[PDB]
Amino acid sequence: RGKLIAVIGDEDTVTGFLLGGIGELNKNRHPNFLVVEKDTTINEIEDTFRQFLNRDDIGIILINQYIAEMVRHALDAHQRSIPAVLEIPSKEHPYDAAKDSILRRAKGMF
Amino acid sequence: PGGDFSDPVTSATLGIVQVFWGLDKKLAQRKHFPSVNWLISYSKYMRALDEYYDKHFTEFVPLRTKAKEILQEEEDLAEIVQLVGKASLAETDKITLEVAKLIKDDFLQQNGYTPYDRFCPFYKTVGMLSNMISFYDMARRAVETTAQSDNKITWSIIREHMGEILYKLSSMKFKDPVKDGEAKIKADYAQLLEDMQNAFRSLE
Amino acid sequence: PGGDFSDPVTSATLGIVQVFWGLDKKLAQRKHFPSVNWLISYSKYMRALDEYYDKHFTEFVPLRTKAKEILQEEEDLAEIVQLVGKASLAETDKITLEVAKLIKDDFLQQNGYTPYDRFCPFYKTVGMLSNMISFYDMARRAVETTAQSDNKITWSIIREHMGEILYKLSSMKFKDPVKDGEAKIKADYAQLLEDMQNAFRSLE
Amino acid sequence: KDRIEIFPSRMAQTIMKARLKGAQTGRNLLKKKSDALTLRFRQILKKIIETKMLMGEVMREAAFSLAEAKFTAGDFSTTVIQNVNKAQVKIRAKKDNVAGVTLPVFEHYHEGTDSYELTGLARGGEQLAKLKRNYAKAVELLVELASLQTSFVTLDEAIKITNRRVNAIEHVIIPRIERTLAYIITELDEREREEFYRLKKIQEKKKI
Numbered sequence: 001r002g003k004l005i006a007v008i009g010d011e012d013t014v015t016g017f018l019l020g021g022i023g024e025l026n027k028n029r030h031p032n033f034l035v036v037e038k039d040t041t042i043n044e045i046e047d048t049f050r051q052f053l054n055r056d057d058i059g060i061i062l063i064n065q066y067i068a069e070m071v072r073h074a075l076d077a078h079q080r081s082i083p084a085v086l087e088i089p090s091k092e093h094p095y096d097a098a099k100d101s102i103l104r105r106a107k108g109m110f
Numbered sequence: 111p112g113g114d115f116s117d118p119v120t121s122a123t124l125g126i127v128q129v130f131w132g133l134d135k136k137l138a139q140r141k142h143f144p145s146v147n148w149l150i151s152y153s154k155y156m157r158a159l160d161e162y163y164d165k166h167f168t169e170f171v172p173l174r175t176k177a178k179e180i181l182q183e184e185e186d187l188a189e190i191v192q193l194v195g196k197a198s199l200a201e202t203d204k205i206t207l208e209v210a211k212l213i214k215d216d217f218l219q220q221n222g223y224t225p226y227d228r229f230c231p232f233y234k235t236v237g238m239l240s241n242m243i244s245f246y247d248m249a250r251r252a253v254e255t256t257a258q259s260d261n262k263i264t265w266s267i268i269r270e271h272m273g274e275i276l277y278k279l280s281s282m283k284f285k286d287p288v289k290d291g292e293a294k295i296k297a298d299y300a301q302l303l304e305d306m307q308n309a310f311r312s313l314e
Numbered sequence: 315p316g317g318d319f320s321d322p323v324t325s326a327t328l329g330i331v332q333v334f335w336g337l338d339k340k341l342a343q344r345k346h347f348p349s350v351n352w353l354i355s356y357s358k359y360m361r362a363l364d365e366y367y368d369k370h371f372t373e374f375v376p377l378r379t380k381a382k383e384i385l386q387e388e389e390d391l392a393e394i395v396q397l398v399g400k401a402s403l404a405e406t407d408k409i410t411l412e413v414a415k416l417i418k419d420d421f422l423q424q425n426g427y428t429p430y431d432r433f434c435p436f437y438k439t440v441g442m443l444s445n446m447i448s449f450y451d452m453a454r455r456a457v458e459t460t461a462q463s464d465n466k467i468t469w470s471i472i473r474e475h476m477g478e479i480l481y482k483l484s485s486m487k488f489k490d491p492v493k494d495g496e497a498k499i500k501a502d503y504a505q506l507l508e509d510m511q512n513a514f515r516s517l518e
Numbered sequence: 519k520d521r522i523e524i525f526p527s528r529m530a531q532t533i534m535k536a537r538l539k540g541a542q543t544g545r546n547l548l549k550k551k552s553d554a555l556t557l558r559f560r561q562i563l564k565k566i567i568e569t570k571m572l573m574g575e576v577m578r579e580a581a582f583s584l585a586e587a588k589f590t591a592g593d594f595s596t597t598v599i600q601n602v603n604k605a606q607v608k609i610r611a612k613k614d615n616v617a618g619v620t621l622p623v624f625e626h627y628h629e630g631t632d633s634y635e636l637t638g639l640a641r642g643g644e645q646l647a648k649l650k651r652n653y654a655k656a657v658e659l660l661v662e663l664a665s666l667q668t669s670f671v672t673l674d675e676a677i678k679i680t681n682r683r684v685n686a687i688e689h690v691i692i693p694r695i696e697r698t699l700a701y702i703i704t705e706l707d708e709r710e711r712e713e714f715y716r717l718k719k720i721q722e723k724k725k726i
Contacts (some may be wrong), residue, residue, distance in 0.1 A: 001609070003608075016649070019649055
């Protein structure tokens with residue numbers, strides 16, 4: 001209806017999810033996703049993550065597993081249900097349950 | 111002494127009087143007079159008067175019994191909802207709660223300083239109670255039939271379509287016998303019952 | 315007999331005396347010498363002595379009133395923090411609770427054998443109360459101004475800001491006035507107020 | 519604190535026994551709600567791991583489908599990344615009344631503006647179409663996981679507050695009321711015995 005899924009991913013996953021229909025340019029004419037290449041810094045990535053968090057029109061986010069590891073403290077600094085944040089694997093980093101903030105909230109449930 | 115049953119005198123008189131008319135302190139603080147408990151009270155004259163009310167009216171006994179059941183179920187649901195903050199009020203619970211709340215507000219308290227309340231005869235009471243049980247019955251039947259079949263009917267559509275019926279039902283209280291005859295008021299009760307029937311048919 | 319203040323002798327005594335100093339065994343279990351309750355005690359003679367206390371000081375009434383207010387509000391908040399678990403606290407509430415803790419531990423407590431509080435004259439009492447009330451006022455004003463605009467000051471921030479000043483404030487009571495001069499302690503407490511003002515200006 | 523402030527009496531005994539009964543019923547009712555909440559927590563966590571493993575392998579499906587799409591077409595990456603105008607998939611937020619507390623959930627929406635058509639990348643449209651299908655199915659399963667995860671995160675604090683309430687009720691008020699009732703029974707006994715003795719002394723005096 002009004003909220004749009006957003007993707008912070010490397011080039012291949014980003015093409016994959018743009019191909020699945022995920023993607024918009026808002027009235028402000030900006031992408032609702034970010035491209036991750038080899039040459040990026042954790043600090044501006046964290047500021048863009050904050051741009052995502054504070055913006056109201058997202059709901060759910062989709063971040064790779066090593067990309068989510070690269071920003072782990074800032075990622076886990078947020079605890080609110082409405083901005084859902086979900087982790088996905090990648091080609092070279094299959095899924096890892098031991099590395100996940102929400103499954104860390106479920107402490108001792110193993 | 112103290113407004114309770116501890117004293118020997120109140121115990122002894124309670125143990126030999128046929129009919130007890132316990133009066134609530136809290137309802138006396140609520141100013142919904144007369145402040146009758148309706149729960150700690152009793153009377154051992156139902157059964158004898160059953161024969162009387164069958165010979166003359168043929169309608170009072172089931173209406174009265176249902177009135178007690180609905181009031182009591184409201185009391186029990188009140189005792190339940192205190193903790194959950196009425197969050198778990200379902201549809202049937204809502205109908206029961208509203209029906210008994212209306213019974214409290216319109217037909218369980220009178221104003222002794224006004225012409226339309228200083229005295230209600232038997233037949234007038236029977237008419238109002240018949241009307242109460244009537245709308246309860248029709249509302250419950252409608253919601254049950256629609257929940258079983260399709261397009262469940264909730265209290266929101268009920269309030270929307272038949273606000274006039276409910277207003278008329280609350281305003282039966284003011285059918286002043288002092289300034290009006292018996293024929294007018296009885297025809298009013300019958301015509302409001304038929305209006306409720308017609309409105310429920312419209313919403314069916 | 316047993317601390318039960320409803321016993322006959324205390325009941326007869328409370329009606330005749332003018333000043334009453336209720337004492338609490340729980341405090342005496344804490345060794346909170348003197349174990350006075352400070353909430354059920356009273357004294358009808360305050361009105362007759364306000365005139366004297368003005369003809370000598372003129373700067374005690376606000377102190378007393380604010381002390382009563384802070385203690386009363388702490389006692390009210392006691393239940394809310396007991397049930398909740400010290401989470402649902404606006405910053406002013408935490409401020410008053412913790413300043414109440416400081417006044418209770420510092421001004422109210424006093425040892426009755428150690429040389430440095432065998433005796434305590436009135437002026438030191440005035441000095442300590444003025445210090446603590448002024449600190450309360452400055453802390454709340456700073457937190458109000460930083461709350462309305464932005465960057466609401468948490469109590470942890472002021473704690474880490476001036477824990478040393480808090481430590482000096484509490485250790486104020488080590489004086490033994492018998493040896494040291496009165497004006498020396500007055501200048502000492504003025505110096506602590508200067509320290510607090512400097513800290514609040516630097517945070518300002 | 520340890521005793522509810524009231525004058526002891528028989529009426530008081532009745533009111534305090536009633537208040538104790540009310541507290542007990544409240545405790546039982548809270549226990550039932552906690553049972554339902556932990557049931558919801560367990561059933562939510564039942565197969566989140568399973569569905570997440572399905573997610574991982576489906577992502578790998580889409581991944582090597584992309585690997586094979588890197589073959590026929592070529593350098594499509596920048597062509598796609600530049601062509602970004604509108605979304606064909608959207609979140610239709612719904613509600614889920616799992617218990618007495620309601621948690622938001624989501625729904626998979628096909629908005630309607632079809633996926634765009636790139637027929638020029640050296641004529642490799644078939645691989646792009648199967649890749650579209652793969653990532654569409656993946657995104658469906660992912661919105662399902664997102665709904666589940668949202669409900670889990672809110673239901674955690676819901677359970678915490680309920681458990682705190684029941685614990686505070688069972689370890690504060692009930693002992694207090696019980697001690698108050700013990701004190702009340704003692705006081706009533708005292709008061710009756712005083713009258714007994716004084717009546718006895720009248721009786722003895724009357725013998726003379």
